[PDB]
Paper text:
Upregulation of the methylcitrate cycle (MCC) is required to assimilate and detoxify propionyl-CoA, a cholesterol degradation product. The transcription of key genes prpC and prpD in MCC is activated by MtPrpR, a member of a family of prokaryotic transcription factors whose structures and modes of action have not been clearly defined. We show that MtPrpR has a novel overall structure and directly binds to CoA or short-chain acyl-CoA derivatives to form a homotetramer that covers the binding cavity and locks CoA tightly inside the protein.
We instead used MtPrpR81–486_F155H as a mimic based on the fact that the other CoA-binding residues in both proteins are identical. MtPrpR81–486_F155H remained a tetramer in solution as shown by SEC and crystallized in the same condition as the wild-type protein. The overall structure of the polypeptide chain superimposed perfectly to the CoA-bound wild-type protein, including the helix α1 where residue 155 is located (Cα_RMSD = 0.314 Å). The 2mFo-DFc and mFo-DFc electron density maps showed that MtPrpR81–486_F155H also bound to a ligand whose electron density matched with CoA in general except that the ligand was longer than CoA. This indicated that a fatty acyl-CoA derivative was bound by the mutant protein. The ligand was extracted and identified using LC-HRMS and a major [M+H]+ peak with an m/z of 868.12 was detected in addition to CoA. This mass corresponds to both epimers of methylmalonyl-CoA as well as succinyl-CoA, which share an identical chemical formula. The methyl branch also caused steric clashes with the adjacent residues His155 and Arg159, while succinyl-CoA fit the electron density without steric overlap. The carboxyl group of the succinyl moiety interacts with His155 (∼4 Å), Arg348, and Arg159 (∼2.8–3.2 Å). Since the MtPrpR81–486_F155H mutant was generated to make the ligand-binding residues identical to those of MtRamB, the observation of succinyl-CoA bound by this mutant indicates that succinyl-CoA is likely also bound by MtRamB.
Numbering used by the authors:
A (entry chain A), B (entry chain B), C (entry chain A), D (entry chain B): 152 to 480
Write the structure that this text describes.
Amino acid sequence: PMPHEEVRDFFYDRNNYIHDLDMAAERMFTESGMRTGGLDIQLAELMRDRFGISVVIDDNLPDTAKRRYHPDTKVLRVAHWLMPGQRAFQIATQLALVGQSDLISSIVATDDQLSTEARGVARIGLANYFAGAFLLPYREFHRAAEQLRYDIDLLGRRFGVGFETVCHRLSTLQRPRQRGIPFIFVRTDKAGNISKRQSATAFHFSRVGGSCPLWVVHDAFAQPERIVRQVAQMPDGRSYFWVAKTTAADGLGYLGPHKNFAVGLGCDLAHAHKLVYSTGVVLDDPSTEVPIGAGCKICNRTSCAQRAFPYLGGRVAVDENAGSSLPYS
Amino acid sequence: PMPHEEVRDFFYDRNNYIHDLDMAAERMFTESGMRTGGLDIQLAELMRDRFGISVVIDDNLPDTAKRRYHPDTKVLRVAHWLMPGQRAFQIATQLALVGQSDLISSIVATDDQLSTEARGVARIGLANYFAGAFLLPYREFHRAAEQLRYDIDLLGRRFGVGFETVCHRLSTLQRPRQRGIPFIFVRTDKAGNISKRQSATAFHFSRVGGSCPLWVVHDAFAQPERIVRQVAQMPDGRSYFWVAKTTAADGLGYLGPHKNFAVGLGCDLAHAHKLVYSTGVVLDDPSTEVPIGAGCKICNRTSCAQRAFPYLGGRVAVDENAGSSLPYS
Amino acid sequence: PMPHEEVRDFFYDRNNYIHDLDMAAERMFTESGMRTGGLDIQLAELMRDRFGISVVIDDNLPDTAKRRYHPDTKVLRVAHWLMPGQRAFQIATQLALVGQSDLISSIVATDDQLSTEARGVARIGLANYFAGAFLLPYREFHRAAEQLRYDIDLLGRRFGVGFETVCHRLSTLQRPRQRGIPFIFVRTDKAGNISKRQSATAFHFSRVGGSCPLWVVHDAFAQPERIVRQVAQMPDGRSYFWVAKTTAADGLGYLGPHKNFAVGLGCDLAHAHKLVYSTGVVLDDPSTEVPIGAGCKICNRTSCAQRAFPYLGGRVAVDENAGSSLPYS
Amino acid sequence: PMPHEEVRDFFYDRNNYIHDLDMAAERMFTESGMRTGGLDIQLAELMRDRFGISVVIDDNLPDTAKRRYHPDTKVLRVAHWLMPGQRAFQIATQLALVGQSDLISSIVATDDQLSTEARGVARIGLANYFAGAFLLPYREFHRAAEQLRYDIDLLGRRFGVGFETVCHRLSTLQRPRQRGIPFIFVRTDKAGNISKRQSATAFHFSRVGGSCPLWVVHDAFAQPERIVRQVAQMPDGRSYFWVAKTTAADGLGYLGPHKNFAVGLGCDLAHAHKLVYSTGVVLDDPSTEVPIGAGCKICNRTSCAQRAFPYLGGRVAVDENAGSSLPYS
Ligand SMILES: CC(C)(COP(=O)(O)OP(=O)(O)OC[C@H]1O[C@@H](n2cnc3c(N)ncnc32)[C@H](O)[C@@H]1OP(=O)(O)O)[C@@H](O)C(=O)NCCC(=O)NCCSC(=O)CCC(=O)O
Ligand SMILES: CC(C)(COP(=O)(O)OP(=O)(O)OC[C@H]1O[C@@H](n2cnc3c(N)ncnc32)[C@H](O)[C@@H]1OP(=O)(O)O)[C@@H](O)C(=O)NCCC(=O)NCCSC(=O)CCC(=O)O
Ligand SMILES: CC(C)(COP(=O)(O)OP(=O)(O)OC[C@H]1O[C@@H](n2cnc3c(N)ncnc32)[C@H](O)[C@@H]1OP(=O)(O)O)[C@@H](O)C(=O)NCCC(=O)NCCSC(=O)CCC(=O)O
Ligand SMILES: CC(C)(COP(=O)(O)OP(=O)(O)OC[C@H]1O[C@@H](n2cnc3c(N)ncnc32)[C@H](O)[C@@H]1OP(=O)(O)O)[C@@H](O)C(=O)NCCC(=O)NCCSC(=O)CCC(=O)O
Ligand code: SF4
Ligand code: SF4
Ligand code: SF4
Ligand code: SF4
């Protein structure tokens, strides 16, 4: 149980919603006079007025540094190559770590099983959560999500942030009397590594699994920078709607290392009709659903032409007198 | 240690070359009067003349059946939708299982640690090996590979078989005093599941690992049916040349299940200059080599922007006053 | 009016159906005892028995030659690297040119506007038509198309031929009392060059136009080797269903020149419900239809964000005080 | 000769460099105290101080409006969804049109063959040129291009602008005694429509042509957001180096209309060694050069497997006794 997995569980156990921290972010947004649009500058003004922290734009930082905070002189340097939404995210992260320290500490104190390292990692996680809840204040963002029928591009345009940030925030809308579609958010790379798992409730991939090549999230790299959608059926009959898309980090140069990821958002099929991404698709036809699994070794399907491995709790039929398109019959 | 892994190791231990069986395949090829070009027809005639086995092309077989052998009437039914190279492969598989039974049994008897099921899986594996060594007789195939500078498409065209079959056979050219480029052959899917591992000698991915998203094999699906090439450097400094390409199964219909795989062939950089795939590429410039790993949890690189997980034997450094492009620095 | 365009018109004027030639191909198929499956061998037998023509498989031909017929000794050589469907196509083409010469001549004689070169080009075109009508005899192919709901992959599997050949034959099903879906067939390359136009009746792209980047046929290369589908609306309100897919020629080698094409098949929206490719799509929602054009200079749309050129018969609004996402407002 | 072509030629005749206007942009940049990094803010302040123009960021503008200028109250509204580089570009466009009116008029007066509409289009073109020359002052941009070895991503990162803007400016570095690599810049879509042509000197595609599917610019869409590179040889023996990449407009929503374009930059092969994009590529091997053309009807190659149409000044050779891989041999 490594610390990043420990924090994964910390968030999964709390339905991916932190009521104290989300309320605090929204309260501060409103009390400060914030207005959506160009939050980076207003957050600079807020750090100055409320914390004596001076926010500067630094093209002198090392290439890989997004921000650096000097607590001795209270100076926050932010990378020039970050877009305004990204600058705002960095500034609000530091704002959480400086001005919401005690709240974060008390939230961490509620899971006493946490490893020594897991507590620091959770501090950073709650700081990122605060930044998301501030850039995307709960009520305004929820109403915008409903009005826009969950169009992630349009939400990003309205709030001045990227795709991954929007999907993050969508998977946290579990406030008691104002809930959005319950989502599972995942992040993957070209090799099937799932870097991030967040979920409003229990989904198949909340903690483990997801190495099924028929799952559309892995097809996002085959269709780069375009939204892919799938009506999927798990081996147990439960049906889900999946949207996914690639995200690439600009800059770095032709030679340099590049960041390529795929962000995917899934929900119960019953909710799909509320998404713009359901437009043009029939949702009431179980014949049109794509049968996927969780990874071949833990998948009990018997007629899958794509099986890479045999099912673990399964009987290996070996026939010298037959050959089929169905590996590991 | 599941049986398919036991057979993976069985072949790995023999440098992916089976001298008795390969010599037997070539002996039978030449003694029977075989000539490359239309092996399917000649193999049918051979089964008749030498084993009393009647080969029919049966469009009445189930959709997913490639072949079926009835030993009571010695009837081999072969799917009509298989190309001639594929039909030849099926017929030669049955030829190995019927006319080379004892040789295969004695070869299996040499790895006595094999589980009961692993022996059956090994019989199927050795029959496939024999089919490959028969359709592609060793000396003729080796001379053609050198003449064609390892152009896999041109080899397939010359011998009437597909990409995966050619790569299979290329990774087996370890006959003493007539060796080809030592290769590692792998097969993967969109989810990074590595279905096949065969290797002439010790490579990093001969048995485990290979979930590095910077590795070109996983970039094959973004460029389907197009050959991708990479000069890669493992974290230990050793450099390799990798060629890869996707392979899709035709038919099945728009709705039906589809087979999508990616086949990759790797060798030491020192051999790359003998490949047609090196044309246009500089091989002597360590600056141009792509730093890849074997999977993030077992990768010790320190400045990778693509890290999905932290390195296992390392402490997760967490800094509240900085944010970087380098996850898990 | 160049000769290939002249033959384009020759076929367009005849509703892409040649009743005499199609009936002759089917009549000969049936009288000869032909059975679907492995037509290449049976056509060899037919050339021998009926025309004294000897069909041989020649790996000695130049790389680019699919067949060569020596009339002095009546010998037809066919390339070894052609699949059986392709071999059958070559053999039946020569069969049309040798055994249906007078019929072809009389069909050509019906369009007396033909240029000197256009008559020879039309001879080859009618020979290809005969080959298609023979490999795919009309009644059997029509019934298979209806039973399979026009699944091009499954039709290819059943009849042992490729995607482009199937789409060719589908666009010719205009026999008076046994018509299939009326189609427009097109072939394009990565640069928008439309090499082939065939159509059962008058469609927008039967003769000219088709340089609209929003048209899905040009998106086939972005999604290689996978079927793409679109519900499109022309500027005049008429709605069409478009299926398209790439096709690549095997062999040639890593260095050599490659053939990449996209084949597209379109029909009136009203017919889409009879296609398997309509599965999962709502067809009764004009809101979900993609507005395309015929090429920007002849497209009268006013709010297209993708306009590359202004509409020819249009008023150029030029405003120094505004900038928009809509080029050439 | 439509007006947009007239302006294309207007710029082509001046080697895509406007000395007075470029010097004016740089003069104003330096005299005003401008420093690269946050030009949007400084340009707003400059419009205030120097022209009494009040710049507001207006989230109330219509969805498709990038800017709108009200001269009666001297109010410049700029779209909230534009990144800072884009906002700076809009503001500098208006700055050219308001504060450089007479210079632009006198520059337009030098091509007196211009149609009435061509003069307005040329005014917009010269304003865009000025905006490019201001956001990217000539000397600083030239020094940065050489230092960065023409890495377009790194230039964009350094100056806070996108790919298309950098390529625009790179193709204008023809100031006497301080020249950059002479470039041809083109913009195309999925249908091969070439929306933009700018060129430092005489290139094949400076005015017409470019519909060759083997040309790498059209392969950009198959690999979106990834840089593609090609060493190409025209039929006349002259060899060029081509870099290309797609550019997509964010937002707009899943349903809405999308802008997809491909931008390409070409130079003589002799200059390629100065590009970062040449790293790993051999430049002195004529065997490895890809033979491309300018469009099949104006391409005289004789063994091209990709020909879509026959060569215009040639007779279509038709052989009834042969079939080949070479259409229109
Ligand atoms: C996972 C890592 C370590 C990786 O960091 P990266 O360098 O890849 O990127 P990043 O810093 O997360 O930022 C990437 C994008 O995500 C956005 N973003 C990040 N966290 C967000 C949040 N909580 N809410 C909203 N948006 C958020 C940022 O704005 C940014 O957008 P832009 O790019 O547009 O600017 C980090 O995210 C992190 O430390 N998170 C907090 C700790 C945590 O939650 N760990 C559990 C992860 S779950 C896990 O690891 C389990 C997986 C498993 O099963 O093994
Ligand atoms: C792996 C399976 C079980 C599944 O195979 P599939 O049904 O998906 O396909 P396939 O039968 O292998 O056929 C696909 C193509 O491979 C070709 N092919 C297959 N074996 C070949 C060989 N030995 N030599 C040459 N070509 C060969 C066939 O001609 C065919 O070509 P066409 O496509 O053109 O028709 C099978 O291949 C098999 O039983 N192999 C023998 C058992 C074995 O060796 N297992 C160890 C694998 S190593 C492993 O799985 C462990 C790896 C790990 O644990 O990480
Ligand atoms: C167009 C050319 C010149 C190009 O030949 P290519 O080398 O590109 O390929 P090809 O010989 O046509 O064969 C390619 C595939 O098409 C199939 N195929 C070809 N003709 C067929 C037909 N009539 N019916 C069924 N299938 C057919 C072959 O089986 C083959 O399948 P496999 O690959 O799987 O084996 C040729 O097709 C031709 O000469 N056709 C006859 C003359 C004609 O009709 N000209 C008008 C074309 S329309 C036009 O040019 C107008 C465009 C415009 O607007 O300017
Ligand atoms: C071509 C049009 C009409 C259409 O343009 P669009 O609306 O599609 O986009 P856009 O306005 O050009 O802006 C897209 C990106 O290009 C950048 N950009 C535009 N002009 C630039 C310049 N001169 N220097 C540097 N960057 C420039 C913008 O910053 C912007 O960056 P971001 O995307 O990051 O925001 C327009 O560009 C224009 O009016 N140009 C001036 C008229 C002109 O020169 N016409 C001749 C073109 S030659 C032609 O069309 C004929 C070719 C032929 O006939 O074959
Ligand atoms: S066996 Fe299960 S997990 Fe594996 S590919 Fe098939 S459906 Fe997916
Ligand atoms: S950390 Fe290692 S395994 Fe992971 S992406 Fe980077 S190089 Fe590959
Ligand atoms: S203007 Fe017409 S032809 Fe051009 S992209 Fe738009 S819809 Fe297509
Ligand atoms: S004929 Fe010329 S223009 Fe056409 S694809 Fe070949 S090289 Fe390109």
